[PDB]
Design a protein around this nucleic acid. Structure first.
Lengths: 98, 92, 22, 94, 80, 99, 78, 103, 92, 21
DNA sequence: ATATGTTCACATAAAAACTAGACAGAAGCATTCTCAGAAACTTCTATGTGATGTTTGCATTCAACTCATAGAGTTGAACATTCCTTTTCATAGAGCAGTTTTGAAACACTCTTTTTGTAGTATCTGGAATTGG
DNA sequence: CCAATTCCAGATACTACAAAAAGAGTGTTTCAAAACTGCTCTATGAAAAGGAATGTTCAACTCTATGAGTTGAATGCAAACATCACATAGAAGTTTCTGAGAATGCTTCTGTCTAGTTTTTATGTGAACATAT
C-alpha cells in the first residue's frame, strides 16, 4: 500500500535491490538499511552522469543523448574518469587531443 | 521475461532535463554501469563482513565500502545522500 | 572550465596527475 | 592534409575495419583451437570483438606515440610499441 | 590477399593510427600491428570458446565474449 | 685515478642482499605524521609488523619504478636518470600502477 | 621536517639496487613526493580498515588488506 | 580410512570441503570438487618446493629461505605469469644488469 | 588455536627432498600462496556456477576454472592430476 | 631447461614483448 | 697490493623431536532437491544471387624525415674529516586488546492480494540526406 | 560552406496483464554491553660507533647545430570484392515435463593438529692461508 522507495524519497527500486542482495550469496543475512543506502548511492551516481551528459548534448544543438555524449561527460570529469578507468564505451570514440 | 533499469533512468532524466531524450544503446550502457557498480559495492561489503567474523550486511558495511571505493568528493556526497535517505526512511 | 552541478559538487577536468608538485 | 584527416577521424565514432575479413580471421582462429569442429557465431559477438580490438589498438597507438615523442622523433617505430607493451607489464600489453 | 591475416589492409591500420593521433608512420608497422591483433584475438577467443563449451552449446554468444573480456580485466558496456 | 667503477660492485652487492635500505626511525616518524594528519585529532598506535610490512611494500614499489624509469632513460638515449622519465613511466603505467 | 629523514644515501641505495648507474640532483625531491603519495593512499585505506572495527591500533592485516584492495599482494606477513 | 588416503594425497580433503561449505560460494557443494582442488593445490605446492629445493642445493645450502622461493618463482615463465602481482617479503630482485651499461 | 598447512607442506617437502629443511618465513609464504590460489579458484567456480543458472559446484566447474586460470602446461598437468585423483577416489 | 618430477619442461621467461614470425 | 675464495673453533638463536588432549573429521540412514533425458518448434545462422560502386592496389617522387659527429657547457661521483644521530641492552606502567554471558531487538519464513514493470501495438518526430544559393 | 526542403527510421505514447513485492504475523539468532585478565606499546636511561654532512675537484655526461642518406604521403587510374537486397532452407537453442541419483541434516565414535617441553644443530663471527685483477 506504500512503496519503500517512496518512503525513502527515491526513484530507484528498494525491493528489487534487497532481493538481488539476498539471492547473490554475499552473506547469510541482510540488514534493512543496506538496500536503501545502495539505491540512494546508485541514484546519485546516475543523476550525476546524466546531468553532464545532457549538458554535453545541449552544447552541440542536440535534443537526444547518444553514447558519444556519455563518453564526453565521463572523460571530461576527474573523479568519474578515475572511477571508470578500465571501462570501454561502445561507439563512444575518443577525446580530441592534438 | 527480462529486467533492466530503464524506467528509473528515464525518471531521473526527466528530473534533471525535462526536454531531452535518449537512445537505446545509451540505455544499455547505463544498465551496464548500474550493474557494475552494484557488483563492486556488494562484493566489497561481503568481504568486509567476512573479515570481522560477522554474518550480517548492514548500512555500516555499505558506507565503509563506499568510502573505500569512490574518490574523495564523490564519496563524501554519496555518504551524505545515503545518510539522508536512511534518516528519512527511518522516520516513518 | 569547471562545472558546479547540483549539490554544489565542482566537476573539474583532469590534469597532469603524473607530475610532483609542492 | 594529414591534419584535416586526424581532426575528422577524432570526431567520428564508426568502425574502421571491414566486417568480412574480420569474420574470416576470427572464424579461422576459433577453428584452430577446437578439435576440428566448426562453431557458429552470432553477429553481436563479432561486433563486440571488433569494438574491443579497435579500442585496444587505438589506445596502444596513443601510448606508443607518447614514447615516440619522448624519444625525440615524430615517426612511429615498432620498438616504441614493444617498449609500451613492456612497460604496461605483462597484463595490459600483450 | 589469400591469407586471412592479409585481409586487414594498410588503409584500415592507417585510419586507426590517425585516430590515435599519429602523424607519420613507417612501413614496418603493419606486420607488428597484425601480430599484436592476432595475439589479442587468440587470448580472447580461447577464453570465449572455453566459456562456450563449458555449457553444451555449439554457438558463440556475445555474453561469452563479454565474460572473457571482463575476466581478462577489460569491461565492455555496449553489448551487455 | 681514484676509483674506476665502484658503482658496478655496489650494484652487484646490492642486488644480492635482501635487507631493507631505509632506516626504521625516520620511516616510523613519517608514517605516524601522515596517519595523524589523516585522522581528526586522535593518535593511533602502531604494531611493529605493520610498519615493517609498509616499509617492505614501499621499497619494492620504489625499486620497480626505478627499473621502469631507467628503461625509459635508456630508450631516450641517455645514461643519467631524469624526473621526466619517472613522470612518463607513471603516465604509461596508468592511473592505478602509476598513482 | 620528517620528510627529510629519508636521506640521499638511502635513495642512492634504492636506485642502485634498481640498476641505475647515474642519478641527477633533482631526483630526490621527486622520489620523496612519490613516496609521500604512495604512503598517503595506503595509510588512508589502512586507517579506514582499522576504524571500521572499534579499534585504535593499526595491525599488519589492515595494511595487507589495504595493499590487496589496490592490486598488490604481500606474502611475508600473512 | 581417511579421504585423503583414499584419494592417494597428502593434503586434507575434509578441511577443503569445510572451507568450501563455509565460504559463501554456492548453496551446494559436490563430492569430487574438494578432491580435485586438493590435488591441484598439492601439485602446485610440489612444483614450487622442488624448484626451491633445487635452487637452495645449487646455492650450497641446506635450508630454504624466502630468497630461494623468489629465485624459483621468477625463473619459471608459467609460475611468473601466475604470480604476476605478488610481492615476496625479504626476497630481493634477480641479478639483471643492462648489457649497455656493462663494458 | 590457529590453522595452517605446515604439516602438509612438510610432508610434500620430505617427499621431494628428503634432506632439506625450511624456515618459518618461507612456511608463512607457502601458507599465503595456498590461501591465495584457493580463493581464486573458488571464486571463479562460483562465478561459473552463477552464469549458467546452477546451484551446485561440481568437479566440472573446478576443472573449467582451472583451465581458465592457469597457463597451458600447468593447466594440462593439473587437470591430469585432478582426474587421476577423482578416478582413484571413486573406485573405493 | 629443467624437467621436474613430472615431465613438464620448466622454461625461463626469455621474451614476450616482441612479435615473432 | 687487496678483496676474493677457502678453512677451522663455537655456540647459539633456531630448528627439530615428544607428548597429551580438545576438537575436528569419519560412518551410516532418511529427506529433499537438482540436473539429465526426451520431444517439438521456432528463431536465427548459413548459403546463393544480382549487381556494384565503392574502395583498394600499383608505380613515382621529392620534400620531409632519421642518423652520425663534434664542440661548448654542465655536474655528479670520489674522498678526507667529524660528530651527530640511530642502534643496542634494560625497564617497567598501563592503555588497550582478547575472552565469556546473555538477552532484547533485528532478521528470516509463509500466505494473500494488489500494483507495477513488460511485452505488443499504434502515432509522432528528431535527424540525415540532397540540392541550391 | 551553410541553409532549406522532404522522407523515414526510430523514437514516444498507450494499453492488458501476470508475477513480484508489501501486509501481517511468528519463530530464530546474534552482537553489543559489562566484567575480568593479560599483553605489548610507549616513554625513559646509559653507551657508542659508524654513517650522514660539508666541502672541494675533475673526468664524465648532455645539448645543439649540421651534413649525408632514406622514405612515405600525395596523385592518377584501372581492377575487384564487401555490401546489400532478396530469398531460403534447416539446424539447434529454447521450453516443458518427468524421473533417478546425489547432497544434506543429524548423531555417535575416532584419530590427529597443535600448544607446551626439551634435545640437537647449520651457520654467522672471528682469524688465517693462496690468489686474479
Amino acid at each position: 500500500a506504500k512503496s519503500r522507495s517512496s518512503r525513502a524519497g527515491l526513484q530507484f527500486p528498494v525491493g528489487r535491490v534487497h532481493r538481488l542482495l539476498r539471492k547473490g550469496n554475499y552473506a547469510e543475512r541482510v540488514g534493512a538499511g543496506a538496500p536503501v543506502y545502495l539505491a540512494a548511492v546508485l541514484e546519485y551516481l546516475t543523476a550525476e552522469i546524466l546531468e553532464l551528459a545532457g549538458n554535453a548534448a545541449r552544447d552541440n544543438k542536440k535534443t537526444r543523448i547518444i553514447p558519444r555524449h556519455l563518453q564526453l561527460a565521463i572523460r571530461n570529469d576527474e573523479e568519474l574518469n578515475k572511477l571508470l578507468g578500465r571501462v570501454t564505451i561502445a561507439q563512444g570514440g575518443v577525446l580530441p587531443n592534438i | 521475461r527480462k529486467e533492466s533499469y530503464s524506467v528509473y533512468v528515464y525518471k531521473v532524466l526527466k528530473q534533471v532535463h525535462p526536454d531531452t531524450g535518449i537512445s537505446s544503446k545509451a540505455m544499455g550502457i547505463m544498465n551496464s554501469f548500474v550493474n557494475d557498480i552494484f557488483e563492486r559495492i556488494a562484493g566489497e561489503a561481503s568481504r568486509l563482513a567476512h573479515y570481522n567474523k560477522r554474518s550480517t550486511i548492514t548500512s555500516r558495511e555499505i558506507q565503509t565500502a563506499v568510502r573505500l571505493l569512490l574518490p574523495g568528493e564523490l564519496a563524501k556526497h554519496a555518504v551524505s545522500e545515503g545518510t539522508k535517505a536512511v534518516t528519512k526512511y527511518t522516520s516513518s | 572550465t569547471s562545472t558546479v552541478t547540483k549539490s554544489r559538487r565542482i566537476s573539474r577536468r583532469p590534469s597532469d596527475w603524473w607530475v610532483v608538485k609542492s | 592534409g594529414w591534419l584535416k584527416e586526424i581532426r575528422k577521424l577524432q570526431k567520428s565514432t564508426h568502425l574502421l575495419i571491414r566486417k568480412l575479413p574480420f569474420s574470416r580471421l576470427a572464424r579461422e582462429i576459433c577453428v584452430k583451437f577446437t578439435r576440428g569442429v566448426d562453431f557458429n557465431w552470432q553477429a553481436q559477438a563479432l561486433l563486440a570483438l571488433q569494438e574491443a580490438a579497435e579500442a585496444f589498438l587505438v589506445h596502444l597507438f596513443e601510448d606508443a606515440y607518447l614514447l615516440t615523442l619522448h624519444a625525440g622523433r615524430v615517426t612511429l617505430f615498432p620498438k616504441d610499441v614493444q617498449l609500451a607493451r613492456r612497460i604496461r607489464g605483462l597484463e595490459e600489453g600483450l | 590477399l589469400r591469407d586471412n591475416i592479409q585481409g586487414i589492409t594498410k588503409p584500415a591500420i592507417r585510419r586507426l593510427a590517425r585516430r590515435g593521433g599519429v602523424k607519420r608512420i613507417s612501413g614496418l608497422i603493419y606486420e607488428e600491428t597484425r601480430g599484436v591483433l592476432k595475439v589479442f584475438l587468440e587470448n580472447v577467443i580461447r577464453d570465449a570458446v572455453t566459456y562456450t563449451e563449458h555449457a553444451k552449446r555449439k554457438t558463440v554468444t556475445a555474453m561469452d565474449v563479454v565474460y572473457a573480456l571482463k575476466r581478462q580485466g577489460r569491461t565492455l558496456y555496449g553489448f551487455g
